[model samples]
Target: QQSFDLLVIGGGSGGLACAKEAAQLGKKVAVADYVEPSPRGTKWGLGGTCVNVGCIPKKLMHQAALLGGMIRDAHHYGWEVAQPVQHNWKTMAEAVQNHVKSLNWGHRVQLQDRKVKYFNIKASFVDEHTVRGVDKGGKATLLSAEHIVIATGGRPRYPTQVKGALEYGITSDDIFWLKESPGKTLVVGASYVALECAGFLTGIGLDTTVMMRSIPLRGFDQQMSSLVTEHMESHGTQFLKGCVPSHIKKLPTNQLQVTWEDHASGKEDTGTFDTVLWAIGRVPETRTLNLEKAGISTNPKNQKIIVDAQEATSVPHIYAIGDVAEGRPELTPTAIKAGKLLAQRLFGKSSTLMDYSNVPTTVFTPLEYGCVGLSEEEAVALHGQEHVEVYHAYYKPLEFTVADRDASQCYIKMVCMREPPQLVLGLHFLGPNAGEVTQGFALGIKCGASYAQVMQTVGIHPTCSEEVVKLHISKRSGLEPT
Candidate 1:
């Protein structure tokens, strides 16, 4: 039996951060990680989903798609670029995969440099303080620690209710790894993943369609979600709204035949495509951990570990973070920050708790959407409609001027208290470089800046972000915020 001060299962963004931080704090830490191949037999090296299959590869491909648009706009920007530049899926896929590989290696080297032991094995709880890890060859090792952390994250969900979904459908897990392009792709569901995948697919000149059973981005602001889908629609992405998939069948020609029912009419419709990508949602990777054996309680609803403010699971010595933990936003930065804060509290004589409030996030679509703090609906629900005030504007970006791009959806909204000098509760922006703009404002919101402070600030000339300072129109006033 090998003994350590701390053990982390799942070498993901959260797990790696926790393990490395603990090791740096002079605690002996070991991390175990293994990638379970997707149904399509797609697998990759370490650094978990974010590095191998999620953020890294997805962003690279998104950039590839964005470049395609830029190339089209370049001719209008006084650049003698070739007209109608072609996109090569193979070249983009190869480059993204290679870059992901390097990140995986970099994570390994970081672990080594930090003196944290790394194991490429699947881990299962053997007892309260013991874990047994098994590698691909069936070799096993027993590890014991005073504390253990589960940060297994999540994977894309498959609709088992739909016949042949497992056999003929692909998910984000396999999409980035496919060597050949998924021509004529049908992306099911309305999650950010669905929109993102569909966005890039359409950008790369594929016949991409998004089929949603309900409103897109269920947990996000519905108004912003509508704008996102609308922008994608204007950019040539087809949408089959209010439809639920019933079944998937493989044709003799190696194409996929999909049957879906329209909710309103209750009529069944069928479509054939080269690929069916499932982005419905994700499930926590808790099924294989034998959590019951360790007496760690998990939420029955989502199978995520139940944790407290300190990130401690039901069992005091056991902790959970990232997507595997209940109520934590499934974001890489949130996980990393949580992991580091938990480590500091545990070993560095620090008492800071991880703050889950006012965390900012961005949806990378054709027109990006970024937001922080409470949403308009959430604010109204909590503070009542009369107690909340919303400031909004519909502005055009300078870059879009030359390209004649549609700027109707390029908007911003600020949700605040109804009282004088209204305290800003939320900030939402839907436009170019939304992430950059949101990140800067997020810091102010986090620091408890009020609406008065925001207005008092000077604006940068002719910039989209300056609109935030110039916002004076209130939704409550019923006047146009132009």
Candidate 2:
């Protein structure tokens, strides 16, 4: 058995970051990862989901779709461009994967140069303080560490009702690796993943259709949820609202015939398409970790390993982080932060509790939508509607306004706390550079910055990010001065 100061399971974003930080703090660290030999359609093999499948690859696809739009507008802008500019999905897929592969290699190199040991295997907790793993060729080894950290993230979850889904439909996992662009894709769900993927499919000229049972993006701010639906409709993707999928069958034409049950009435409808993609949601990937061996418990149904604020599992010396582990903000950054903080608490001075409030997340669909801090819903719940302020504005993007796709309008909003009316509760936008813009606003919200202080900072002229802090209320802060 090999022994180390720390052992990190899963070499994704959070796991790798945790191991790196622990090793730098002079703790002996070893990381257990698996060989994803073939292109797995994940971003940095080293960077985990955000770098690989979730963020980087998704962004590239969104850009490709955006470029398609640019080409369509080129003629109207009088650029004299070729009438039929050629584009290929495989070409873009290969180029982006290669770039991601290079970065993944760099991550391994970074760990090696730092003398952090890494193994390619599925790690199982043989005991509270010991883990056993078998490498690619089935070579077995045991690692005994002072503390064990589980950072295994999650992948898309599909309903079991579709028995042959693996053969017929693809989840987000394989969607990025798709060499052929889907021509008539049927996307399932109304959440960010469904909306974003559907947007890209339609943007790239696919006859995309989204079917959802009730409201889309069920847990988000209801008002913005409606806006996202409207936004997608404006872009031409068809929506089958208030519907639930009955079953999916591969037709004789090799197309997917997705039958649905209309929620209100008992009528049924079917959509036949070239491909079916499920973006319903994600669940933890902890099936093989042997959690029970370590005295750890999990919700058998949901597959989430129970964890505390310190990210500790029921077993004292073992901890869990990321999607597979329970908690808020399932973004890659949040998991990365939790892992790093766990490392610090275990092996460094001044251990601190993770401040989970105000985590910024971006859902990229060509257009960026994200928030950090109390959402408008949370703000009103906290300070009461009368004590909270909502400010929003719509403006034409200058570039498109001049170029004729003048339909481009940016959405900006701010949430301010009342009582004393001092703190800025939330800051958000759905526009270009929102990812770039939300960083500052998120920081301000995290630090409890006041509206007066925010106004003191000068806005950069002619930038979408700058519009975040400038807002005028069309109505009173809350419930009609009741």
Candidate 3:
């Protein structure tokens, strides 16, 4: 058995960060990963899901879709081309994937230069402070350490009702490496991934359809969620609302025949498509790690590890970060932040816990949606309705003025508390570049800026972000200031 100062399992975004941090702190570290590249995408490569299947690659495809929109708007922007420009989906897909591959290679180089031992094997805890990993050659190695971190991320949660679930109707993981357009595609779920994928496939000129039990983008503010649904509907994506898919089967043509039903009414519907991408949710990839052998407790149903405020898990000598750890927001940034803070808490000179408040998140759609802090409903739920006040407005974005794009309307809103020195609760936006716009507001909230501070602050000229300060809405009476 070989011993090390620390052992980090899983080399996805959060795991790699934890390992790098511990190694740089002068602790001998070994980072092992179990990622196997699939036949379709570059996920089998070293950089982990974010580099292959998740954010980095997904965003590249998303931007490619947006570029198509930009091309449509280019003619309106006084740039006229003699010939109609056409985009090849496969060509663009390959190009974007190649760029992602380069980044993955760079990450591997960084890990090597840092002198962290990298193992390509499946890791499982053999004891409280010892882990065992096996390589492809049937050889195994044991690592015992003072502390062990499990950062094994997550994979798309599969539905239980279907047969051939493993082979038919793929998840988000398989979408990137799709060799050809699924001719006609049906995307299930209305969350960010579903909405984004629906828009992307449609933009790439695929006959795309969406099915969800509720209006799309379920977790967002009520109004904004509806707005996104409206935008998606107007953009040629078909929506099957109040319906649920019963089963998906692979057909003779290598297509998928999905049978669904309208839950509101007893009507049944069936369709054949190239693929049905499931984006409903993801489950933590921890069960295979045999965490119980280490006496590490996990969430009963899904087995996600439980972590403390500092990302410490039930076992004092063990910690889990990212999606695999229960209670941490499963977003990429949340995982990264929690991992970084966990490192600081464990090895740094000073003590600092992960501050999760007001973390910013973005949903990439044709019309971008982003928000920070407590939403209006969240504000009211946290504090009483009487203690929360909301200000909202609708206007046209400045960029649309030049092109006179009537469809590019901007939706803006702010939620704040009612007590004295009233603090801003949240800022929400629906329009172009919302991700960029809301991040600034996140920083303002981080500075402890209040609603009054926002209202009194000097506004920058001719920008959508400044609209938060310039927004004028009818004020309800008897709302006292905090």
Candidate 4:
């Protein structure tokens, strides 16, 4: 048995940040990380889901899709670019895989430099104070720690309810690591993952369709969600709304045939595709940890570890952060910040707490959407419709003018209190560079910038972001916004 001051199970973004910060604070620490191969045998190294499959790869593919549009628009911009440029999926996948590997190496080196022990093993709790780790060889080692942090995060959910879904459908975990294209793909569900993957596939000139049983982006504002799906439609993606997939099967040709029921029509429909990608949702990785042995309680509904304001688990010395914990944002930056702050509170004697409010997020669709603070519905629900006001605008970007792109959804909105000065409650933007634009304004919103203050700020000329400052048409005024 070995002993350490801290032991972190699951070396993901949250776990890595927590371990490194604890080490920097002069505490001994060890991180145990393991990647269970996907059903299709896709596996990756050190940096967890974001670095390996989720955010990093998704963003790269989104950019690849954006480049396709840029090239198509180049002809109109006097660049004399050739028409019908082709995208090679294998080449993009290879480059992206290699870059992810480099990041994995970089993570390992950083841990080494920080003197944090790294173990490529699966871990389970032996007790509140001890953990047993097993490597691929089935060899086991026990390590004792003064404090333990669970940051195992979560994995993509498989729709086991659908017949042959697991056997025939691929998830995000397998999509990014594929050596060849997922040609003529059918993406199931309306989650961000589903839409994002479908968007990029269509952008790269593949036939992609998204099947949704209900509303898209379930937790986001419904209006903004509609605009995102609308923008995707304008760019050639197809949608099968009010549809539930019944099954997926492999045909003799080795392609997938998907059968679904149209909820609206109460009829069955079928589609043939080269691939079926499932993006229903994700589940926390707590079951394997044997939380019962550790005496930590989890939410019965979702199975996420229950943590308090300071991220303390039911057991005092144990903590949970990131996607594995209930009520925390499942974002990399949020996890990193929460982990670092938890470490500081534990060892550095800092009193700061992680703020889960007004966290800015972006959905990297063909027409990107970014927002911070409350959604329009959330604000109105909390403050009452009579006490809330919304300012909105529709403007065309200068680049869209030359390309003749549809700027119908190039819009921005600000939600504020109805009273004087009307402190801004939320900011929603839909257009190109939405992430970049939202990031700058998110800081102001965080600092409690009001509607008056935003108006006083000088507008940047000919920029999509300037629309936020120029918004004057109130949604309550019953006037059409130009």
Candidate 5:
């Protein structure tokens, strides 16, 4: 049996970070990782979900989609190359895949440089301090350690009740690895993943349709969610609301025939497309880790490890982080930060815990949506509607002015406490480069900045982010702030 001081299972962002941190602290660390192929048999090298299938490739494809819009506006900006430049899916797909591959190799080198042992194997806990890992060729190895961290992350969920959903659907897992274009794609769900996939598909000049059974971005601000879908709807993506897919069948020409119905009405409809992408939700990668064998407790509902503030599971020597840990936001940055902090707590003689509050995030839609801290509904729900004050604005970006773009959906809102010295509760922004615009304000919200502080702050000339400081229209007054 090969043993180490610490063992980290899974090689995603969080897993690798913890392994590296522990190794740098002069502790023997080993990392075990394996990619379980998607139903369609799509798989990638390393770097986990964010690098291969989740953020990296997803963002690259989004940029490819954004280029199409930039090309349309380029003619106005005095660049006369061609009219309606075509998009080649193969070109973009290969480029994105190549970049992802490099990052995988990069992570491999980083681990090697840090003297952390790496294993390409599926691992499950064998005992309290023992894990057994199996590789592709049916070989197994037993490793024991004083401490273990589980950070296997998550996988996209399949709606098993929906007939043929598993047989005929792709997901974020497979879409980024597909060799050819997902022609005439039908994205099913109301998630940010679904909207982003559909948004990029439409932006790249494909015929795309979004079919949803309920509201979009369920956990996000409904007002911001509405504008997200509305912008996509007006920008050429089709939407089928109040509908759920019933079944899928393969057509004679290798296309997919999807049968759906309006849940609230007695209406049935059918659509045929080249691909069906499922972005409904994700499940933690705890099912195969044999957590119970090690006496680690997991939440029955979501299958995520029940972790305390120390990121410790039921067993003190064991810990869980990232998507596999209950109540942690499913974002890569949070995972990395948590992983590093967990390592510090274990060895760095530090007593600081990860501050998970008010973390910011952005949805990379065509018309991007970015927000941080408590949402308006959350503010009102926690402090009562009478105690929350909302200041909002509808502003036009200067860049959009040149393109004559519709800026109706370009808006901002600040939620704060109603009383004097109103402390900021949340900030919601929808517009071009919303992620960049929201990042600075996200820091302010996290640090407990007040609404009056934002008002007194000076603004940068001629920028969309400056509008955040310019917001003065209270919902009560209903007048544009001067």
Candidate 6:
């Protein structure tokens, strides 16, 4: 009789954290994970993509790129170094990969110490309280629980519309684990993943190219999107637009040859390269669970489980979190914190719930854009045109400037109210460590920060943080200074 208090499916960052909390609170829990390798046949042990493939690995590589930026500019600081240096992909990937393996080992060890059983299988819901899973040995196990949480995260998407796209091309998943350097590469799509991969590759001295159909970084303000696109192109990576790739063929030279149709341009070109990375977007996987048997509800359009404010699904006892649930942000912070809060509310008798709105976040690789609160559209929408005020200025940073780098637009924009003793509704601080620079201000934004209270707050010495104190021109003023 394998009965449990809380059973979580998919041992992702969110799923694991939730199980850990419940286990801490003396609730018997079972966590299950499965390995579905990418089309590139790449697979890792566990902990899902957060540690296995995505955030951890990407950041390690992003840092690799950032360090490259540091040295190129460091050379300008009269430091004893050559003008240019090359970084090895294998060294970076090997190190990044080892760390991922270590984290997964820690996760299993911690789970064992807490008496939470780690089941290696693809779990399926037999009912709201009972789940069945089978191992590779064809051994089946059935577990019953009073409650269950579906934290089944997500996987990067491939372009099904384009043939040879999935067969010859790889997604964001395979980029981190390549054996050798990808010589000249083609990154398709226009999400943060695409931009970030292109960012690091370019920084590492690879001939990186990003081809997009239209639009990028849709939410969190497209203005910031433009910021990264221009910055990336200016730095190294080339940008191509208005073309839909139709074919990707392998040549006798073992290189990838690509062709695209220009729907708008009426121009045709063959976009051949060593690798074509399809980082279009991501989708929450639901294939493992038979939600119908469990009576779990999901979004019709997006297919993510339909979760309410309390993170509850269609059934009261069944819940979902992270990318598995619709409307929640797809970052690990929201997922981990959301799951922890859910565990507390369910097991520890806390009534508190998560507030995803007005949360702080940033996109790495294509430089950081520290973001919190409302963007401009929502800023004006919520407070009305007269009430909304925009503060923007293209500033300078010491490090980039010192490195003899053409550090374009170390700018920050604040969206607040024009009312007396104003309330800072939103922000867009674009520069290095923007997330770190802008994180603290999320408090002032939500705390009903007064206008005079901010400027009077004084500046931090020789830092970009001080720029918030010096917003002389409002966008309404018609004239501006660089």
Structural similarity to truth (TM-score) of each candidate: 0.98, 0.92, 0.94, 0.99, 0.98, 0.97
lDDT tens digits, residue span 344-384, model 4:
99989999999988999999999999999899999999999
Candidate 5 wrongly placed segments (more than 4 Å): 480-482
lDDT of 3 by residue, 1-482 (tens): 47877788988888888888887888888888877543233255666677778877677777887777777677777888543567687897788778877877887887888888888888898899888899878789888889888888888777777665556777777788766666788888888888888888877777888888876666678777777778877877888889888888888888888899888788998888887787888778887888779889988987789887767787888888888888776677777777677677778875877777788887787777889887677788999988876777676776677756654336777888778667888888887888888888899989988877877888888877777787546245533211
Cα error, residue 343 of model 6, in Å, equals 0.9
- lDDT for each of the candidates? 0.91, 0.77, 0.78, 0.92, 0.91, 0.85
Give me the displacement of residue 245 in model 4, in angstroms: 0.7
lDDT of 6 by residue, 1-482 (tens): 29889999989989999999999999999998887789889888878778987889888898999988888776667788876687989999999999999998999999999999999987889988898998878888998889899999989887767878878898877999899898899999888888888998998899999988887777758787888788888888898887779888899998999998876778878867999998888989886688989899777777799989999998999899988898998889889998899999999999998988788877885567788888888888887888887888888787766666665756778887887666777778888888788878888876768666777788887988788767657777765635
Model 6 spans with C-alpha error above 4 angstroms: none
Please state the error at residue 333 of candidate 2 in Å.
1.5
Higher-lDDT candidate of 3 and 6:
6
Worst 10 residues of 5 by lDDT: 473-482
In model 3, the clashing pairs are 37-44, 418-482, 419-481, 419-482, 420-481, 420-482, 421-482
Model 5 deviation from native, Cα RMSD in Å = 1.2
Show how many residue pairs clash in every candidate, following the order shown. 0, 3, 7, 0, 0, 0
lDDT of 1 by residue, 74-120 (tens): 77889998787888899999999889989999998999998888888
Better of 2 and 4 by lDDT: 4
Q: Residues 1-482, candidate 5, lDDT per residue (tens digit)?
A: 48888899989989998999998888999999999899899878867789988888888899999888888777777888679688999999989988998999999999999998898989998899999999989999998899999999999999977888999899999998888899999999999999999999999999999998899999999998998999999999999999999999998899999999977776898989999999999999988988889999999998899999999999999999998999999999999999999899998898989989998999999999999988899999999999999999989988887777889889899999999889999999998888898889878987889998998999998999999999889987868642
Error of 1 at 189 (Å): 0.5
TM-score of 4: 0.99
lDDT of 4: 0.92
RMSD of 2: 3.2
Worst 10 residues of 2 by lDDT: 35-44
